[PDB]
Every structure is written in C-alpha cells, then in structure tokens.
Amino acid sequence: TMSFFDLLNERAKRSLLCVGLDPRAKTAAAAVEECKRLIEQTHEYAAAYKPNAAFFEFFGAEGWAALSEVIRAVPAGIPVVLDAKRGDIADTADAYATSAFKHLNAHAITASPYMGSDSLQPFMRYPDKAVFVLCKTSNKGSNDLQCLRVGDRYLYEAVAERAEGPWNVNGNVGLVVGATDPVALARVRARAPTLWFLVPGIGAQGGSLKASLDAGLRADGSGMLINVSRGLARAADPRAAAKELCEEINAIRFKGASVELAKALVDSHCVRFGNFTLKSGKSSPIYIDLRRLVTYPAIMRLVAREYAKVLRHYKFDRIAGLPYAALPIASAISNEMNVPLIYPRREAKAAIEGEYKKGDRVVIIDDLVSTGETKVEAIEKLRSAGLEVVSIVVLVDRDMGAKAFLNKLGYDFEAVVGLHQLLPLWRKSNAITSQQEADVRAFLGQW
C-alpha cells in the first residue's frame, strides 16, 4: 500500500496546484466530458485533483455514477481529494467513510470540525487516506463564527491546535485555510507549522497568490495545495493556464537567489562556448569548467555556501569529494560546515583517502552532472569500501536527464541550480549572447 502523503509529496517536488473538478454542465454526460478533457489538459502540472460532490450530486442517480467514472479517469499518481465536507456521529460517519475510500476510491476527504473528534475518527482511522478539516474558510462570512475568541485566540486557531495535537494520531490530518484571508492563513501556520493546507479561493473568489504563499508555506517550502476550480474551467487554454499557475507558484517558493551565483560563474570564466565534445561523442555548444574556481577563493567560498543550503537537509557523517574538480570545492564546503572530508584516489587496498568507518553516511560532492556515467563509477567505488551513499549534490545540473537516471539506479540526487535556470540570468546580465542562449536552449530540447 501507499498513503496519500506518499503520493502527494512526490508531486510536491514538482508542483502544488490542485485542480478543482466542479462540472456545471447541461447533463451528467456533459459533466463527465468536461472533466475528462480538463484532466488530460492539466495532469502534467497538477499536484492534486478535487471533485466537489455538490456538482455531481446535482445530477441525482446519473450524477453518482458520473462522479465514480471521473475519479477513475485520473492517472494513478495524482491523489484525489473528495470535497464532500462530511461530519456526523461515528456510526453514520462510517458509512460516509466507506463510500469515499472503498466505493469511490478517493484518497482524501474534507470534513467539519464541529461535531468533535469522535466524529472524525471514522475517517482518520484509515492510515492510507487523508482528512482535511475545515479551519478558516474562504467565504466572506467565515468570520461570523470562526473568528470568535475562545480566550487568547480565535476559534479556528483552537481547531488548528487540536488538528496538530489530539487528532493527528497517525499523521492524516490536513486543514482547509482560505486564500482570500492571508492574515488568518498565517496564524494557522503559526498554530500548525507542520500540517498540509488545502487552499482554495484563487481565480473566481479573490486572489493574493503571493500573499497566500508567504503566509502558509512551511520551512520546506511545501505544504499548500492551491486549488483553482472555476478559474481553469472557464479558461481558454487550460494546459497553458495550468502551467502558468504551476510556474507562478514554483517561482515564489524556493533556489534560492541564484542571481549572484550566475555572476560568480561568469566572473570566474567557468562558462565557455564552442563545439566541445563530451565523454559521449555528442557535441555541446556550452562547457562549464568549474576547475577555474580554484583561482578565485572568494567565489569558491560563495559556491561552498550554496552547497550548504542543499546539504542542510540531509543527515550524514562525511563528505566525499571526487577529484580533481570537486576536491577543492569539497574542501571549501568541508570548511564551511566542519564535516570530515573523504576522497577516492583517481585510479582503479582502499584507493580512498581520509578516514572512514564502516557504514557511516556520506554525501558525494561533484562539480556538475550531465548524464551520470561518472556518478556511477564513484558510487560503486564507495559502496565497495563499505559506505552508505546518502545522495549526490552538485552545483550545476546540465539538464540531460541526470536525476531520473540516478533515481532508477537507486541513489537519489540534488543540484543547486539547473542550466535552464541560469540561462535567463546570463542574458539579462549581458553575459550571454542572444545566439548563445537560443543555441543552448535548442540543445536541451533533445532531452
């Protein structure tokens, strides 16, 4: 089995956009049509899909068979949140729970806090499924009841507290916080700093796409499903609209600055252009030589500083820098962090310099990755000598499908910046010519 948050965190590495499936059509058949078409258009950029029962229940009996088809018409990788807003006495709630998880095969459900936790356990007892409790709602008359003071704090805050504490027995509980109220959104994140937030209101209702995000995002730069329903269904080109939102969201979250790094690579003469031939016979118009970094200790300290931001998220004992290029970089990083360095002697009863135990956790540091052929030689030489490779961290990801290769190889990977990300900056800084940019852009389409 796999839980909702397993599936969701996977898509959260890519996007946070949740597609609201709210039919509104001539008939029940028409309703299915619109949705099917809305699924196929958006699925690449969609973190989640959210059918709201109301618009399906509108069509009566034909509407229920309609909801079930639309739910199965979702590719097996985008979690489906049923917006049903259930909440009744345990025994009645049970029937609602089986209907949503066993009959409709939804991965998550919306619910009301009002009837207490014993009304929510019937839904929360499913460890694989998620429950998003209503906290602060997007509607203007939410403050009518939710903004009442329960001594020191508002009611929704009291809800938030309970949602993270007494109720989150097995890490299932999410909260519904509305985008039209950024101030309330921020307060719930202060009360539930860990939880996931289902956030509607963007498009038809209000906005504050940025203000919302600055308010309720976690330390990880994740934990907000931004839901747009009517806004995409009334849109002209849903695929473009979906992409635009996905990107607009991703541009606000995260990198971090990347602008000063871009300069550093150019001030170090690392970026060079021509007809270079890599270890593949195939020629690239651009070559990045981070071996030059050695002649600029100040830039090298900056580079090491960028690596640290990535490496602050992994638990490890030692650093394994791969000579030549990476070894000075790895030395610099080692200095910023105060973590022991290790390095494989470039050859074919250890061939490994430094000091390692057996089964201590290392992170492989390399300069850049194009494909991953080099990254394998190293993982095999290191797991050889009895070391657990945590990940590989790199300054520049050349964007030749290096992540996916390594993932399917087993060990995961992360890069500080991508080649595609650096291009717009260099052009802006006049470091790269118009022809140089489009040449590189064209080269990356092959992959």
Of 366 and 397, nearer to Cl ion (C-beta) is 366
- Lay out the site mask for ligand U5P across 372-411 (x = CB under 6 A, - = otherwise): xxxx--------------------------x---------
Site for its own copies in 8-37 (CB under 8 A): 22
- Lay out the site mask for its own copies across 143-172 (x = CB under 8 A, - = otherwise): xxxx-xxxxxx-x--xx-xx-xxx------
Of 2 and 409, nearer to ligand U5P (C-beta) is 409
Could you tell me the smallest distance in angstroms from the CB atom of residue 349 to ligand U5P?
Answer: 25
Neighbours of 85 (CB within 10 A): 17
Question: How far is residue 319's CA from residue 342's CA, in Å, rounded to a whole number?
Answer: 6
Could you tell me the smallest distance in angstroms from the CB atom of residue 278 to ligand U5P?
Answer: 5
- Residue written as token pair 């991508």: 418
Distances (CA, A) of 65 to 34, 49, 99, 218, 292: 15, 18, 13, 38, 64
The values of phi and psi at residue 270, to 5°, are -75, -35
Task: Out of 13, 26, 85, 140, pick the active-site residue.
Answer: 85
Residues with Cβ within 8 Å of residue 282, at least 6 apart in sequence: none
Joined together, the tokens standing for residue 304 give: 């090491």
- Where the chain is discontinuous (C–N > 2.5 Å), the residues before each break are 254, 348
Q: Site for ligand U5P (CB under 6 A): which residue of 44, 90, 92, 384?
A: 92
Alpha helical stretches, state H, 81-154: 90-98, 121-124, 143-146
Please tell me whether 288 is known to bind a ligand: yes
Catalytic site includes residue 13: no
93 binds its own copies (CB under 8 A): yes
Could you tell me the smallest distance in angstroms from the CB atom of residue 444 to its own copies?
Answer: 27
Amino acid letter, residue 382: L
- Do residues 167 and 193 lie in contact, with contact meaning Cβ atoms separated by under 8 Å? no
Question: How far is residue 11's CA from residue 222's CA, in Å, rounded to a whole number?
Answer: 11
Site for ligand U5P in 195-214 (CB under 6 A): 200-201, 203-205
Of 186 and 444, nearer to its own copies (C-beta) is 186
**What secondary structure letter does DSSP report for 119?**
G
Amino acid letter, residue 362: V
Question: How far is residue 275's CA from residue 277's CA, in Å, rounded to a whole number?
Answer: 7
- Please name the helix (run of DSSP H) or strand (run of DSSP E) that holds residue 140, with its range, or none: none
Could you tell me the smallest distance in angstroms from the CB atom of residue 134 to ligand U5P?
Answer: 6
287 binds ligand U5P (CB under 6 A): yes
Site for ligand U5P in 349-368 (CB under 6 A): 366-368
Please tell me whether 138 is known to bind a ligand: yes
Of 221 and 418, nearer to ligand U5P (C-beta) is 418
Active site residues: 85
Site residues, ligand U5P (CB under 6 A): 20, 22, 52, 83, 88-89, 92, 137-138, 176, 178, 200-201, 203-205, 227-231, 278, 287-289, 325, 366-375, 402
